């Protein structure tokens, strides 16, 4: 899940605070490539 990736520990500071992956990056499910965008009769659609 995205929640599990967000809580990835990158480093622990001198004051005890933790730096997680969600503190330096946005974690979300998204396509491998955002190049192809298909539309059927104007409405958003996919294809094969």
């Amino acid at each position: 899940s995205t929640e599990e990736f967000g809580k990835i520990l990158l480093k622990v500071n001198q004051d005890g605070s933790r730096v997680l992956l969600r503190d330096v990056a946005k974690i979300e499910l998204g396509g491998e490539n955002y190049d192809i965008i298909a539309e059927f009769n104007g409405q958003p659609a996919s294809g094969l």
Binding site: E3, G6, K7, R18, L20, R22
Partner: protein, 154 residues
Amino acid sequence: DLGKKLLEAARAGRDDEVRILMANGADVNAADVVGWTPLHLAAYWGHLEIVEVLLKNGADVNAYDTLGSTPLHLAAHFGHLEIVEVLLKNGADVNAKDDNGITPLHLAANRGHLEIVEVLLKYGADVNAQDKFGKTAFDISINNGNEDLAEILQ
């Protein structure tokens, strides 16, 4: 011999087979290779009706496996709200610790079971309880990102 058949009857959810084995005098605290009694298997797989039959025939509610895990740890970690209520009713240790210092409250907090955390806390769960790494149930909620759970833990 009879205790081995009871372990398989409690795991497969065969409610009719359990009562027949109980009549023949099967061991209610019979443990397998990993130390799991029939109550551990009933709470792990989620057989509420078998948990009630086992506890009625004098099963050990605070029984622990080869790693100190009790049937309450298994019922809280896998989201079995009905089984947690039945176990706590029969005198289960809400602050039971395994070989890692992990209590059933820690297991219910990591899996986001907000219903089980409320039942555990109602029975007297220690909010400041720490495992071998010094992590409390609140430390898990802030690390996982559960704002609803951190609210209940103050």
